[model samples]
Target: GSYWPARHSGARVILLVLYREHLNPNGHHFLTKEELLQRCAQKSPRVAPGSAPPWPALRSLLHRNLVLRTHQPARYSLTPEGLELAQKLAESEGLSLLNVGIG
Candidate 1:
């Protein structure tokens, strides 16, 4: 099945990691502490513009600047603005979400 909302909260982990890693090169965001927290605890990975995020710990940085959501058949990706931000981070840091370990 598709990893809807990234079951393990991997999406948020991915979100923060992307944000912090980007900060390394772009320097800190003007993000409020609320904004940072909001980014981490969000559900659905995307939120509606001007709407309160379902998860208190997260909200879209582009909440008002762009469309509220992008509808697909079932799964969802980050919004365009979200993608631009994430891509900048990804450029600096490759996907670190995978690691191999075994016993």
Candidate 2:
């Protein structure tokens, strides 16, 4: 019964983006603000790419909430919950792929 949230919520969108990048093969865990914006717009068009950036949608709450707060300027970081969520997202996706390919 639990579906994705980025479809209507911007905050969740940013969260998802951060999660996806955190799983990146490269060592770059923190993404630049520019990278964040482009990444958001990239998936926003295709599928409301998710995360924890200071995007306008969540900028107002950035100061009020610690959901996607960042420690450094021009970069975004993910919370433990963020990584946990994305890990499940990816594991499900990967497992599905594995079943399709190997089963």
Candidate 3:
């Protein structure tokens, strides 16, 4: 059988909403713009309906060296050290990914 490096692409709107709500976590990931967006985009209720975080609030997590931006694909992910902090946060935060029935 083929390796099927196949992975899940787009998430449910709720998944994005869930990710937007959390806005914090750990791992040296470079999952791509949307994935990062999905991550930062997981938690808060403030982003307004059917939209992503606003720039100031949005930039708070991303641009603050919490994770820096860079060229596309090679896009900015958290540094490994910070992300372990992220991972711990994600550990508690991971549940949201697992249990997205927050509606």
Ranking by lDDT: 2, 3, 1
- Judge candidate 2 at residue 35 and give its lDDT: 75
Q: Which candidate comes out best when scored by lDDT?
A: 2
* Leading candidate by TM-score: 2
Worst 10 residues of 1 by lDDT: 66-75
> Lowest lDDT 10-mer window, candidate 3?
2-11
Off by over 4 Å in 1: 1-57, 60-77, 98-103
**Superposition error at 56 for model 2 (Å):** 3.8
For model 1, residues 1-103, the per-residue Cα lDDT tens digits are 2222433244434443434434444543234434444544332245445654334223343353211222322112344454454544444435332221333
For every candidate in turn, the CA RMSD to the true structure comes to 14.4, 6.8, 12.9
Preferred candidate (lDDT higher): 1 or 3: 3
Identify the runs in model 2 with alpha carbons over 4 angstroms from their true place: 1-8, 25-27, 46-54, 57-72, 87-103
lDDT of each: 0.37, 0.53, 0.41
What are the per-residue Cα lDDT tens digits for candidate 3 across 1-103?
Answer: 2111111212222223323333434533345556655554445445445775333332344644454456755344454333444444445445465346766
